[PDB]
Design a binder for this molecule. Structure first.
Ligand code: CDL
Ligand code: CDL
Ligand code: PLX
Ligand code: PLX
Ligand code: PLX
Ligand code: PLX
Ligand code: PLX
Ligand code: PLX
Ligand code: CA
Ligand code: CA
Lengths: 273, 220, 54, 52, 162, 54
């Protein structure tokens, strides 16, 4: 029995057992662009062992052949084929079109928008006047902090520079040690396993870096990590509070973002976002 | 035009009433004289533009919720038409992306088969026939030739040789010949696939002013 | 990463069914025919008096 | 590879405990949507709320 | 609605989009002299980037030939094996000196783009190209097209459908 | 990645015209001169009695 329909990526299909052929014939349907009479026209094209076909209501009154199938598939219904009445219960949906009759909430939100568009210019200009004062106040509140943060971020840079050039000097002295051993003092038959185990020790240390720091060992990220460690250890031995500086800079950026987000609707008379 | 030449069909009306013209009906020629619209005030017209742009914002909110229901049902009807127009091409598209993925797993398994037979060649020829002192530079120049071929891949494809990007590139090169042999138009499928995403992105941009009554977001 | 831009969890990563036996059933016999190719090639090169290990 | 091994461990623990993961995921998306459209209602620019 | 008619608001909106279309197609008027120079500069910068790409390939082939002649013809592998290890370690040193000096890692499709930008910015100064006006026009066109796309939005009623 | 944000297939990858011949015409005649340079350098250093192995 066709007690149910099947949903397939947003479209229904009725598995109606046809009268004169003992099969569960599938029937896909367009819910918006088809009526009931179309579905009864194409249901009887299959077998023509149909002397009566009619879609009813649960209450028992006939459904007109011009109602759309989306309006039919809201509730459950009956499909009367010529001797048996297959009760159909489709699965319940939430919404497809947000359309219904008028409501008092619609007129109460209409006078809300009609009140908004009369005073939104005299409120947005009174907000831009506050923003252009607040931004210059925040930017002059920050002026003692940038003088200290530059002197901290120049010490951390001049330490990570020495870390970079010291790494280059280490991998240039290892070359000199090994190239002195293999040609003057000893030979390559001695210094080949030391070369292999130095390479394997480097490949082991690059994995231990990943286990400890939870990130891969690439060059411009291992530089920035050590720079941030120098910055945060240097800004603690200089009594510099980052929790004020960071909230000043993000507050400045948020005020500038809101200013640039409202000032261009004043130019081109479009909505904001 | 009053010197005798004809005015073309798609000429704008605002261009027409600058000078005179002649209007010819079946047997009669009327000589029209348009007036001069010399009411161009610069002052007392930057105060007419704000009232004219306020009346538009007052009319828009009166006619925006019954507009975005007609557009909503037209979007649903176009979406369920585009899906039925796409659905014959989909079963043809899947059967081209099934041969193009089997020809890509033959390459991915034959790379492993090549590395395993090169391992078996060198491991046979190192311990059994010739010594390791004979068969060490062969391995070194195999390694350097691989390091040269990985650069020639970049010089020819403008793309760095990593595994999944080369797999996706080879898959796309298989697909764009499978879809050429079997007489398949990719352009209609791509324009039937971007129109669906465009029609259903706007359907969820209508969630704001129809579900929670917030102003909808612009394009971008 | 492990989470989305909200707090949801990314789904389970797909697994090739019987992966190690599918790798090892194509690694081993190609290794064996590599040894066969190298053995027959070295025997051919020695039998025609071109490269004899001495 | 670490994150892939973490996801294969978490999705095995979530089947052992019968955790009902998709209700968790749809709640975690739904509260992000409810905070997004709540934060777009308390806009300082849009006059949506009186006495402010 | 009796103010939408006596103030003639529909022609005001169509006048607004006509002003936007005219500003957009007049920003594309003073760009077409500049792209005829820019295409020339970009073409003769890519023609010099491919030279160093093929030169790097030819250098790797030359090093293959030099290290392949000595290990089998003249010398033995017991002489040339430490030389060819220290060449590898010198390449590993040079790829790190590239990172210290250039502040970015040595991968192929980023070194190619950086070298291309250096060739382009040398050639644009050699040909006295006006780059800043080009960037200003390429930003202003991309802003005017977005403003026009937001004006003719089909979900809003900014313009009549006629 | 093989698709866009829609389901639309990405365009064909731009192959280079005669790419393999353009690589093998720049590898081989430079490998030959890399052989000749090393041969002449080895002979020139051997003839002046600086480095002779055997
Ligand atoms: C019974 C068993 C029990 C035994 C237990 C005992 C073990 C000993 C305990 C030692 C613990 C003491 C703690 C020390 C504190 C040090 C802190 C400090 O230095 O303050 C820095 C301080 C910053 O402190 P911080 O703010 O906490 O930040 C530090 C980190 O960022 C921190 O955070 P992070 O998130 O960045 O973490 C990254 C981290 C982790 O990243 C790593 O790199 C991990 C490395 C571990 C891998 C281990 C590899 C295994 C090798 C194989 C074993 C070989 C044995 C062979 C035997 C064969 C016999 C059969 O890196 C480091 O912290 C270490 C820096 C460099 C270490 C390199 C040493 C590894 C080589 C050791 C091998 C020895 C070979 C001997 C051969 C002799 C031959 C005769 O100021 C700085 O100047 C910055 C450092 C600048 C860059 C690095 C400078 C290197 C300094 C020394 C290197 C000397 C020359 C290199 C020689 C290379 C060797 C060939
Ligand atoms: C003449 C004088 C002397 C000759 C010298 C050497 C000559 C050797 C010839 C080598 C040329 C290869 C020929 C292939 C051309 C056509 C390819 C094609 O149509 O493929 C269709 C297929 C799809 O075609 P499509 O859709 O039209 O797309 C076209 C391209 O794929 C579109 O690709 P794309 O645009 O996306 O970019 C990819 C691009 C990327 O470009 C590359 O990757 C080029 C890499 C090479 C660069 C140069 C390397 C430098 C080497 C140094 C040389 C040292 C010499 C030694 C001397 C030292 C002493 C002085 O090119 C390719 O991948 C082309 C594929 C060919 C791979 C070439 C690899 C050969 C390496 C040989 C090197 C030298 C050999 C040493 C000999 C040692 C002597 C003992 O292409 C593939 O990629 C499929 C790969 C299949 C390859 C062969 C399959 C063999 C399977 C046999 C059956 C197994 C049966 C199992 C038995 C079971 C038993 C149990
Ligand atoms: C008070 C001021 C402080 C002064 C302190 C001075 C200290 C001087 C000595 C500092 C030593 C730092 C070492 C820098 C790394 C050396 C270069 C390194 O790359 O050599 C590698 C070999 O070295 C080993 O790997 C050891 C590195 C393991 C990590 C060491 C601890 C690093 C802590 C400091 C991190 C910041 C370093 C700055 C970026 C290099 C070669 O690997 P290779 O095969 O050829 O190429 C691999 C390419 N990869 C990495 C992208 C894959
Ligand atoms: C970047 C970080 C990487 C670091 C990696 C370091 C790798 C270094 C590898 C170590 C090389 C030096 C160690 C070599 C030790 C072997 C030397 C000696 O033991 O072997 C000789 C061969 C003699 O052996 P035998 O005579 O038998 O007994 C000696 C017993 N002893 C050592 C306790 C005295
Ligand atoms: C008509 C259909 C044909 C079907 C049958 C085709 C059978 C083809 C048999 C050959 C298969 C293609 C080989 C592709 C894989 C080669 C194996 C290679 O990737 O292994 C490397 C060994 O290298 C090889 O010796 C040299 C090959 C260089 C590749 C040149 C491109 C040739 C492939 C072009 C097609 C792209 C297919 C990509 C498949 C993955 C590993 O060396 P290693 O250094 O440790 O890795 C470095 C890590 N990297 C890659 C991230 C940098
Ligand atoms: C301008 C007029 C034309 C000039 C024509 C002459 C050209 C002369 C050649 C100049 C060479 C520039 C291109 C460099 C090609 C070297 C290829 C390099 O990869 O070879 C390595 C050997 O190293 C080389 O000996 C030098 C290393 C590079 C350090 C110098 C950087 C030079 C860059 C100069 C800017 C030019 C842009 C680079 C073009 C790609 C061996 O490969 P491998 O070991 O496996 O690397 C691992 C792969 N990674 C990097 C992706 C991880
Ligand atoms: C994807 C991978 C692509 C790269 C693959 C590259 C393959 C590596 C190539 C190297 C493999 C073997 C090379 C052949 C070895 C050379 C054999 C021969 O040349 O050396 C013999 C040793 C004989 O030469 P010789 O002894 O000098 O003879 C006397 C000199 N004469 C000519 C002047 C008379
Ligand atoms: C452009 C290339 C880029 C590659 C990256 C750079 C790599 C450069 C490093 C290349 C290494 C080549 C080294 C070759 C020069 C070594 C010279 C030395 O080995 O030869 C000497 C010759 C040997 O010393 P010897 O004379 O025998 O000692 C006698 C013992 N006494 C002194 C005590 C009497
Ligand atoms: Ca030896
Ligand atoms: Ca080695």
């Amino acid at each position: 029995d066709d007690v149910t329909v099947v949903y397939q990526n947003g479209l229904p299909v009725i598995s109606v057992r046809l009268p004169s052929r003992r099969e569960r014939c599938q029937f896909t349907l367009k819910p918006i662009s088809d009526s009931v009479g179309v579905f009864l026209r194409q249901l009887q094209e299959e077998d023509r062992g149909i002397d009566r076909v009619a879609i009813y209501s649960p209450d028992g009154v006939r459904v007109a052949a011009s109602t759309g199938i989306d309006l039919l598939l809201l509730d459950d219904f009956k499909l009367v084929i010529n001797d048996l009445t297959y009760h159909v219960r489709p699965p319940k949906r939430d919404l497809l079109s947000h359309e219904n009759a008028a409501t008092l909430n619609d007129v109460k939100t209409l006078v809300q928008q009609l009140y908004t568009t009369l005073c939104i210019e005299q409120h947005q200009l009174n907000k831009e006047r506050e923003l252009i004062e607040r931004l210059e106040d925040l930017k002059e509140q920050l002026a003692p902090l940038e003088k200290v943060r530059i002197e901290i971020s120049r010490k951390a840079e001049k330490r990570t520079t020495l870390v970079l050039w010291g790494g280059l000097a280490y991998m240039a002295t290892q070359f000199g040690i090994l190239a002195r051993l293999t040609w003057w003092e000893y030979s390559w038959d001695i210094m080949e396993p030391v070369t292999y185990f130095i390479t394997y020790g480097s490949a082991m240390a690059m994995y231990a870096y990943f286990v400890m720091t939870r990130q891969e060992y690439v060059y411009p990220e291992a530089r920035d990590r050590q720079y941030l460690l120098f910055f945060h250890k240097g800004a603690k031995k200089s009594r510099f509070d980052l929790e004020k500086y960071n909230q000043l800079k993000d507050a400045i950026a948020q005020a500038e973002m809101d200013l640039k987000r409202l000032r261009d609707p004043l130019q081109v008379h479009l909505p904001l976002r | 035009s009053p010197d005798g030449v004809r005015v073309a069909a798609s000429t704008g009306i605002d261009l027409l009433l600058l000078d005179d013209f002649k209007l010819v009906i079946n047997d009669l020629t009327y000589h029209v004289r348009p007036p001069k619209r010399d009411l161009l005030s610069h002052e007392n017209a930057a105060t007419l533009n704000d009232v004219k742009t306020l009346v538009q914002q007052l009319y828009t909110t009166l006619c925006i919720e019954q507009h975005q229901l007609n557009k909503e049902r037209e979007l649903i009807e176009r979406l369920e038409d585009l899906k039925e127009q796409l659905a014959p091409l989909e079963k043809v598209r899947i059967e081209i992306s099934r041969k193009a993925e089997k020809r890509t797993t033959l390459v991915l398994w034959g790379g492993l088969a090549y590395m395993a037979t090169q391992f078996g060649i060198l491991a046979r020829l190192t311990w059994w026939e010739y010594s390791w002192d004979i068969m060490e530079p062969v391995t070194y120049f195999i390694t350097y030739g691989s390091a040269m071929a990985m650069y020639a891949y970049f010089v020819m494809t403008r793309q760095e040789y990593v595994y999944p990007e080369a797999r996706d590139r080879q898959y796309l090169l298989f697909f764009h010949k499978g879809a050429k042999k079997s007489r398949f138009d990719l352009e209609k499928y791509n324009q039937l696939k971007d129109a669906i995403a465009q029609a259903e992105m706007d359907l969820k941009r209508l969630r704001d002013p129809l579900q929670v009554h917030l102003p909808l977001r612009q394009i971008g | 990463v492990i989470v989305t831009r909200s707090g949801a969890i990314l789904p389970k990563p797909v697994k090739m069914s019987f992966g190690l036996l599918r790798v090892f059933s194509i690694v081993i016999p190609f290794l064996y025919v590599g040894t066969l190719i190298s053995k027959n090639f070295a025997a051919l090169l020695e039998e025609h008096d071109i490269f004899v290990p001495e």
